[PDB]
Design a protein around this ligand. Structure first.
Ligand code: ATP
Ligand code: ATP
Ligand code: ATP
Ligand code: K
Ligand code: K
Ligand code: K
Ligand code: MG
Ligand code: MG
Ligand code: MG
Lengths: 523, 523, 524
């Protein structure tokens, strides 16, 4: 259509106004004194959330240039959520600060590309300093504190994550689901976790989390791909009124041959799900047999010769609950037979003892680790559905932050890590003066998380930032208690992955955004 | 779409204005001197009701932020209705009071998260005090009093509930349905009650109660799930014009295929219903056989060898009336054969005797308990349909109240319980001053039910509140007579569950709502 | 006409919005790094100014309730201008801070009347602490520093005002007017220089200068107007016998008398020059008497009783030297008793004390400066008229501040005095908790000028305020150099009267505004 084309400072101030609207909506949520944002839903009741990426995703503006700025900055929060599941508000605050100071530098007349290069150099150096400053979670051993900080000073959630990880291992899968009582319940049940996703995005249910879930789903297993529709049409037709959603696990379902005609078939009564089988060959066949034994089902194979037309409901397996995500699909609880599960575990352990190859040994040890850990389920207790959603979001943030902490380490919370690495980069220089100004923009913007936390506390951000900068190491400011101290000792820990990801994504988007001279959008 | 984003006090006052509109509409109904609200209905005549959740559900506002506040507070009334089926108005009044005082505290500058934590701590302590204050409701007079109070001081409804529970047992099922006559009739007929719900929400009939009902539904029983459409197509085609809505009870029913093509089949002339069979295995087969004997039908099974096609209209059973709800499905009256039902009761009882296992004995005695109790049907007598709906609402409320009363006990009515619990929590303190202010907000809001009752009486809520606070124990104010006295002696009893639920849901939603700094909604 | 009525939080929010509009327009000028505000004028070019009172005067809002708030807070700047002539921006900033904190307190449910009482108590204690903290400003160096600070760090203005005050003295009068040149000029005239020229051009003794120069002349002071030579004829004959020149001050000399005086002027019998008396009714007689006292003469009037035919040489006044030009008359070293001059000056001082009008008081002080001391005129030099107006406003501010400094002393500038006073009042308490909160909001508002100055420099107000509070005595933050030091040593001095007046007026107005619960105004 006809285009509105804006240039220079007019385009940049419109972009900054949209950035500021999104970033203020997100930034009111930052920190332990951060407040909740109500997001209206046409679906049902409004969602009350402290989660910055949710707020950012809901933001969309009427002015088209402001809307472009808001969408571009919204990418920062969405990328932080996708990468680490936490620190999305910190990432948005960093992005807004970089954008504001970089646009001020552009107004001062510095070359925006050189400003972007300076920002990128400063952020690379800051990522290196964050890696150097990071204390591994094994040495610190403060998983409960990380979960508490991520769950907004909810010590119960932090202790729940700590118990779940001490029970199912630091790498075992943990799933957050809606409970039924007022209290949070930890349930270490038998389950399986594999890193695969759905073939099509049309299997997404009414919830907007992007992960499909099934109530007591059916289990169908196959290593050899089927040849015609009539061979599996009886299995789908059988599950037709079997109140257990047919979860098909095979190599790679063609959406045109299942999803299209099934969508023409059902209007949404039940969500037939198809997922990819990870691995290949004999490893995939062994995993399929293990999953069938877990769920009580059987695997169809050409060598065996047993056919889907001969398959019945009793032959196939089942799982109490299954959650399928693009990143990783988890089976929460499969009944099967406990004695059969234990016998299969013993057989796989004997296979480990018999095998001597490194690849076979490591894959079989991954198998036994998955079977031993099972699935930890955290039931979220809440009186109402809006409290349920808020608390579940906070528990998801705590789980993501604890996972990131065990993956990469911890640093001082409350923006102190960024303050410290900015102080160590005070001597960083670029190839020219505009690159040096970009470096200084990045270093000043690294203060923005702490200052926004202090503003949300209603305290004086400049005074607290000065006091923290005058300190050293993990010295910082406890916003929950409004006093200074060693942040590690007070338990205010941030995952190094979360801080690094927030800084990197905010830097990339904001550095690109400060280089924009022209904006083209619909009238 | 483009979003209207409001912050701070503007967002909070819009939210409070919407809360106030919904809460005033609901609160005019509170107490004995509460008045009726007319809810316009597009389908037909307006409904006149004194129920609070109905009014709250109908409230929806033009201003989008006020609408956000109204929907969030409406969740309180809907949650209370779902939990105890009574106390929705009290819950709304509590939620509005907490919201108002918490927003005043936020304007005073207290940290809203700490206010929410104080409210939650006060409400937890208040739930403990409600359990301590509760007195077991184990008398027929007490049950009658609870029903009378819950039926807007209708002693006839209270006595009807008391007689129904003294006849079918304090746990036997009781169903409220319209009566042709102008008088309320108690009918203790044989019936079956099982805790299961419909597979799909597409079986909901015209009435908005969320429970489907069938006129003389046909009964079909199965423990083995079907494989193809053609096995049951003669049964569906038969009942098609047999004259009885086909109620299908099977192991694990599903509508994936059934619901879509059946909806494509009928346009709504008659309602085909499918429900899950509770339990599993031999227990489910025994229950299915019992239901088939009750309704005169037979249970198709692979072991039996019978098939749906083989079954004729005479072979299959029927029920005078069936009401299916998500929580619990009841068969009001399954004719069958009285001699058959008797003989089956004697057989099952002998099975209980013969049996020695604790699980077997318990389930067996539960079976005979259901058979003996049957269903107590209360026919609501009204001259007109609007009076029918109003009186049926009040009878439903009385039934839910009496149920909760026998389950969890009774406390002083007229908001006296909350007053007493607030007086006992006067010494409760939090971790900081904002938490203490939140505790005080909760304690002050616990007075709101009594004050609103007094306002509906047209009396002075402050004077009555102070007079009740000056007293102790079950001392309160009889609003029906405008005189003070012992609430228990005067018969003004509230179910402890109802009071606790109202308080908990109001607290959860209102504590979340007072923490909101930003609101995002469509323009 | 029909009225719009608003109550409680809504009315207070609209009032605060209007106050904030006015204060945001004004506070951008506070401090050395403060900027200029352009005020559109329906007539002439727009005015560029760095004065809070002008910006505040121009502010008027469309929203009626916001306009109410703006007008009320505009009273602060107007009153500060009226009393001290400086500090109007500091006063508007203080009023905005008090209003903001007090409205916050009202939103917390505290009684606004008690908040106002606490604010009043804190401000009274603050005025006492300012008086205690003030130091005299009598040296010319401190006066120059005060003028420089009040002129937006224009050392030339401060030094010029210091020189003017040193010349004219304590009783001297200094006025600021436009100058033709690009440079500021100081013109000081001593003794009597009343603005009346020769009644006849031919009286000019010195043609190359176009002025009459009389050496040791007699002075004739007649309160009446004359047109005939008969009545002064004995006086003229006596003067001619004496041989010294004569100067006539009278309501008017014209016709035959003037012509005869001129003819005798050329003929040389008597060196005579006649000029009009100064001023108008009720004042002209006072001027004549002042001149008689200076020159040791007597005024010839019909009210007093004496006639001019009976006037003698002893009746005539005496002066050392006289200069008549077309525009003004100058008398040098009038031969009159000193004690009489001091007595007449004391009577005029008593009239000043009795006077209740600005015009009357300035005219009486001008008369005093004519009798004793001197009168100075500062011609402001600027390249254009907009620059002329801006510089004239700054010079008038500097002059007002220097007069205030001489009257009541100086305190540390840069909002440091208010910071120290608020620190000294931390223990002050009221009758109840609401009064205590009012005291606290007044004390916190006392930090507003320093914070706004720092904000106008682009720095962090909170950090600088904390650093200044951590200091003691006159330690402060020089905004011009962005450095810390002794405000007195770096020459950042604020008149005690200016600071006290700003605090007092802002407190009174703001305290009344926070007490508002309803607003009544015309509908839109
Ligand atoms: N008590 C505390 N004192 C100081 N800083 C704290 C405290 N608790 C948490 N923080 C800091 O607050 C930040 C986390 O704030 P918040 O959880 O609101 O946002 P986020 O994690 O960046 O994003 P989001 O939760 O929206 O994904 C971290 O920098 C953390 O170290
Ligand atoms: N005669 C009475 N005197 C005093 N209080 C009474 C009397 N009758 C009932 N109440 C009180 O009135 C309250 C019940 O009010 P009401 O039945 O109007 O609404 P509700 O139970 O809160 O909600 P709903 O809309 O679900 O019916 C209880 O607290 C009960 O104790
Ligand atoms: N170099 C400086 N460093 C610090 N403070 C300074 C400096 N120069 C001036 N100030 C302070 O600026 C304040 C007044 O400056 P300004 O002329 O902007 O406002 P004002 O006198 O309050 O207003 P107005 O001239 O409109 O009546 C005083 O407190 C003075 O001490
Ligand atoms: K957040
Ligand atoms: K009611
Ligand atoms: K100024
Ligand atoms: Mg977080
Ligand atoms: Mg009720
Ligand atoms: Mg000034």
């Amino acid at each position: 259509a006809a285009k509105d084309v804006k240039f220079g400072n007019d385009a940049r101030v419109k972009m900054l106004r949209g950035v500021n609207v999104l970033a203020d909506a997100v930034k009111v949520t930052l920190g332990p004194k951060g407040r909740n944002v109500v997001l209206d839903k046409s679906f049902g009741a409004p969602t009350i959330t402290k989660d910055g990426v949710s707020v950012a995703r809901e933001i969309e503006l009427e002015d088209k240039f402001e809307n472009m700025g808001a969408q571009m900055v919204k990418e920062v929060a969405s990328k932080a959520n996708d990468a680490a599941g936490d620190g999305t508000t910190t990432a948005t605050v960093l992005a807004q600060a970089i954008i504001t100071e970089g646009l001020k530098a552009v107004a001062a007349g510095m070359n925006p590309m050189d400003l972007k290069r300076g920002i990128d150099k400063a952020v690379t150096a800051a990522v290196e300093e964050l890696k150097a400053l990071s204390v591994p979670c094994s040495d610190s051993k403060a998983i409960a504190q990380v979960g508490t900080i991520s769950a907004n000073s909810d010590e119960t959630v932090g202790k729940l994550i700590a118990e779940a990880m001490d029970k199912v291992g630091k790498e075992g899968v943990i799933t957050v689901e809606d409970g039924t009582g007022l209290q949070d319940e930890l349930d270490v049940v038998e389950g399986m976790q594999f890193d695969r996703g759905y073939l099509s995005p049309y299997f997404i249910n009414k919830p907007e989390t992007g992960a499909v879930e099934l109530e007591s789903p059916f289990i169908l297993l196959a290593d050899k791909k089927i040849s015609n529709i009539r061979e599996m049409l009886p299995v789908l037709e059988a599950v037709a009124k079997a109140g257990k959603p047919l979860l098909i696990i095979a190599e790679d379902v063609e959406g045109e041959a299942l999803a299209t005609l099934v969508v023409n078939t059902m209007r949404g009564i039940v969500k037939v799900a198809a997922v990819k089988a990870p691995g290949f060959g004999d490893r995939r066949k062994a995993m399929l047999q293990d999953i069938a034994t877990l769920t009580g089902g059987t695997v169809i194979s050409e060598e065996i010769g047993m056919e889907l037309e001969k398959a019945t409901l009793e032959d196939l397996g089942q799982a109490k609950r299954v959650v399928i995500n693009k990143d990783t699909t988890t089976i929460i609880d499969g009944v099967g037979e406990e004695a059969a599960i234990q016998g299969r575990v013993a057989q796989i352990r004997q296979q480990i003892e018999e095998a001597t190859s490194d690849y076979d040994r490591e894959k079989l040890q991954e198998r036994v680790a998955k079977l031993a850990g099972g699935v930890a389920v955290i039931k979220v207790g809440a009186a109402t559905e809006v409290e349920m959603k808020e608390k579940k979001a906070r528990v998801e943030d705590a789980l993501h932050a604890t996972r990131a902490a065990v993956e990469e380490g911890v640093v001082a919370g409350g923006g102190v890590a960024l303050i410290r690495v900015a102080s160590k980069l005070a001597d960083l220089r670029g190839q020219n003066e505009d690159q040096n100004v970009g470096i200084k923009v990045a270093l000043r913007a690294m203060e923005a998380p702490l200052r926004q936390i202090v503003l949300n506390c209603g305290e004086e951000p400049s005074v607290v930032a000065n006091t923290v900068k005058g300190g050293d190491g993990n010295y910082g400011y406890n916003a929950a208690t409004e006093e200074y101290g060693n942040m590690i000792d007070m338990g205010i820990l941030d995952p190094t992955k979360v801080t690094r990801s927030a800084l990197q994504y905010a830097a990339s988007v904001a550095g690109l955004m400060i280089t924009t001279e022209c904006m083209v959008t619909d009238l």
